[PDB]
């Protein structure tokens, strides 16, 4: 405690009463003339000290502080996800025990936990300064904890997997029986405990309580941000460059989550306050992107997105981020395109890959890198993690900063063709969690290529018969992508004799223009419903409002269904019967049309005002603010 070293690379004297050796060292470093006096041994020792201080980013004292360039640089293969390079390093023969320690860390990072534990045991055997010995003991205990937790998770959880053989599990349990991590440091030679006191925290269950509790400064409202960010960079660099396995535990992931989230929220708060005062901040870079991808779950990223306007967060080093994304895509392809799926590695890596591809929406992706990422996401991403709807969501997010190129459109068409071909079986069905299916991919393709026509899907429809109805109804939702002849071939396979058939066709997209026979069908349904008076009614009311029906006779069915009357004749509707919840069901198009009707707009305005004043509902408020209905 004789000196306190700033996170920006400057020292300040405090609690030091004797000679100012740090200031003298800095003065000596500044001038080589004063350096020349030192003895030969002292000259070499000063050179070593200068190397150490420059490498660790300690520049000068507080008084000498000037243009301080605090650029993060974590020199670690594990941090950058250079998995192929890590495997090559492990394959090569280790010259020393330091390379063995690095190998054990890399094996832990690759999911090869048994090999990593055995290598740590070997290093412990062969390492008795004792720093590598202590760190190897710490890492071996960490890897044993990781193995135990993974075994528990696999026992609790989609298919039964046994990555660790029960013989090895029993052996490690016996080897680590009654093993105390608290006593590891106290049992070391007193010379080690003196020289390497700074490593004590590595034996503690928690080591980030100080860093976490210092995060409350980001929640103040009255630089703290740079201090927190530089502290996080320091922790990352120390944990990765030194090859410490605690960098993969839930505590460090949570610390990174909290720090990054609070930093972004503080930046957003500053932005809004500045907008409120001046009346019109967090610049993300490659390391920030990697940290967010690796340490953030998708829920955390979604929380960030909803809380703050991450679209206002400019992303830097985008070429490096694209390299990261392409590397993740290549690793996904290797893990799944081939048969090299490591269960333990995959468990950890799938979350980082998912978060990276989710966060990639904010990064401009080159055409070739975009194609690689898109193909990896569409084809080789396991369905137990991204189902069809989630995969479509991931893909469509990538069009925000990169308009769908022709190559990406071809990739999506390839995916659509494969999806259709998978429908030959009468039991295979698309499973989606977001409710989005292959028709959604086709809709996106048409959105970015309105006149795009799929040749192979057209052919698949031109080969269909009355037997494989699954392919038939699948290609119906892909009608726009089909060709004129293919469209004609498909259309013959459905009948619209009754109203329900018309409803199914409209929902699936078979019919987009209401032919007069369709209007007469709707009319006869209306007549039957009216006669039987003493679900689709609102649908036909909206269709008449939406100018999808020009029959001009629907008015005969006014007076029984509130929504139908409200839509057919807005002027004559009694709005004491209006239910504001209706506005919560219409999409943007219908709400905008209602607002622009020039009739009933004031009624909806007053109902929305009443709702906003009585409930402070954000949904009603945003409806009123966007369309001003």
């Amino acid at each position: 405690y004789d000196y306190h070293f700033e996170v920006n690379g400057t020292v300040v004297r405090h609690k030091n009463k004797g000679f100012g050796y740090m200031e003298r060292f800095f003065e000596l470093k500044e001038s080589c003339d004063e350096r020349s006096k030192l003895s030969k041994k002292q000259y070499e020792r000063f050179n070593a000290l200068f190397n150490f201080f420059e490498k660790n980013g300690v520049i000068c004292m507080a008084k000498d502080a000037g243009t301080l360039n605090t650029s993060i640089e974590i020199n670690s293969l594990a941090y950058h996800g250079k998995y192929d390079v890590m495997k090559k390093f492990i394959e090569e023969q280790s010259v020393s025990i330091e390379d063995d320690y690095k190998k054990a860390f890399f094996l832990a990072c690759l999911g090869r936990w048994e090999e990593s534990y055995d290598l740590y045991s070997n290093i412990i055997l062969n390492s008795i300064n004792g720093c590598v010995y202590y760190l190897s003991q710490i890492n071996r205990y960490r890897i044993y904890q990781s193995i135990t937790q993974a075994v528990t998770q696999f026992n609790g959880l989609g298919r039964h997997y046994k990555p660790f053989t029960d013989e090895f599990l029993a052996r490690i349990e016996r080897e680590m029986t009654n093993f105390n991590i608290d006593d590891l440091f106290n049992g070391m030679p007193f010379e080690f405990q003196k020289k390497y006191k700074i490593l004590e925290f590595l034996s503690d269950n928690q080591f980030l309580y100080d860093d976490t509790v210092k995060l409350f400064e980001l929640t103040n409202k009255v630089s703290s941000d740079i201090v927190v960010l530089l502290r996080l960079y320091d922790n990352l660099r120390f944990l990765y460059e030194n090859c410490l396995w605690s960098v993969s535990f839930h505590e460090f992931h949570q610390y990174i989550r909290n720090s990054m989230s609070l930093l972004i929220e503080k930046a957003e708060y500053e932005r809004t306050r500045d907008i409120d005062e001046l009346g019109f901040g967090f610049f993300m870079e490659y390391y920030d992107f990697v940290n967010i991808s690796r340490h953030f779950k998708i829920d955390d990223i979604k929380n960030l997105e909803r809380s703050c306007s991450i679209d206002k967060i400019r992303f830097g080093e985008q070429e490096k981020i694209e390299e990261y994304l392409v590397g993740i895509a290549e690793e996904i392809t290797k893990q799944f395109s081939a048969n090299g799926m490591n269960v333990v590695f995959y468990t950890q890596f799938i979350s980082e890959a998912k978060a990276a591809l989710y966060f990639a929406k904010y990064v401009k992706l080159s055409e070739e890198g975009l194609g690689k990422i898109v193909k990896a996401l569409l084809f080789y991403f396991p369905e137990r993690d991204l189902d069809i709807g989630k995969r479509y969501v991931w893909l469509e997010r990538l069009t925000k900063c990169n308009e769908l190129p022709k190559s990406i459109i071809s990739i999506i068409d390839d995916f659509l063709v494969l999806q259709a071909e998978k429908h030959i079986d009468q039991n295979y069905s698309e499973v989606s969690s977001n409710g989005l299916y292959s028709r959604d991919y086709g809709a996106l393709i048409k959105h970015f290529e309105k006149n795009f026509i799929s040749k192979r899907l057209s052919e698949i429809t031109l080969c269909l018969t009355q037997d494989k109805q699954k392919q038939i109804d699948f290609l119906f939702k892909l009608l726009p992508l089909l060709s004129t002849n293919a469209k004609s071939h498909l259309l013959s396979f459905k009948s619209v004799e009754n109203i329900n058939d018309l409803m199914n066709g409209i929902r699936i997209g078979l019919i987009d223009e209401f032919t007069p026979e369709h209007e007469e069908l709707i009319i006869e349904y209306l007549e039957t419903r009216k006669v039987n008076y003493i679900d689709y009614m609102s649908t036909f009311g909206i269709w008449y409002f939406l100018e999808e029906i020009n029959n001009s006779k629907m008015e005969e069915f006014i007076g029984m269904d509130d929504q139908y009357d409200f839509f057919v004749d807005p002027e004559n509707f009694d709005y004491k019967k209006f239910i504001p919840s209706w506005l919560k069901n219409y999409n943007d198009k219908l709400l905008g049309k209602i607002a622009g009707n020039k009739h009933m707009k004031h009624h909806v305005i007053e109902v929305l005002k009443e709702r906003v004043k009585n409930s402070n509902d954000k949904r009603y408020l945003e409806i009123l603010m966007n369309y001003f209905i």
Binding site: K302, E305, R306, Y358, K361, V393, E396, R397, L398, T399, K400, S429, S433, N434, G435, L436, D440, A443, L444, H447, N500, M503, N504, I506, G509, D512, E513, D535, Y536, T539, I542, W543, L546, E548, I579, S581, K584, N585, Y586, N587, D588, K589, L590, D617, K618, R619
Partner: protein
């Protein structure tokens, strides 16, 4: 009803209850629940108006609604506790005045949209 949540963006409910219902054709579906997806940004065709899409899952597999799905709830069974939550289901359905007042889960597709 401790796990019941009221999602106000789409004025519906999230509740872990399966439903046994009888449609307008006397058809019987057992252990069926509903999943709502609020998708305002969804790429909409000429005849699409609804903001949210609802899927029906019976016995763990979804169903294709090829006919008019006019239905009445006959029984409601809670997963966490087998207690019948039917009457509460009818009360909430009457109060809500929205299609499918109770949903197994609501999927919000607005925050994950590029346009959000």
């Amino acid at each position: 009803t401790h796990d019941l949540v009221y999602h106000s963006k789409i004025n519906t409910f999230v509740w872990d209850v399966e439903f046994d219902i009888v449609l307008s054709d006397s058809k019987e579906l057992n252990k069926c629940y509903f999943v709502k997806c609020f998708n305002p940004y969804r790429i909409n065709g000429k005849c699409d108006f609804a903001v949210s899409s609802i899927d029906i899952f019976s016995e763990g597999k979804r169903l294709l609604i090829e006919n008019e799905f006019n239905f009445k709830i006959t029984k409601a069974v809670h997963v966490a506790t087998s207690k019948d939550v039917t009457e509460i289901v009818l009360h909430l359905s009457e109060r809500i005045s929205s299609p499918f007042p109770i949903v197994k889960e609501v999927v919000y597709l607005d925050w994950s949209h590029p346009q959000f």
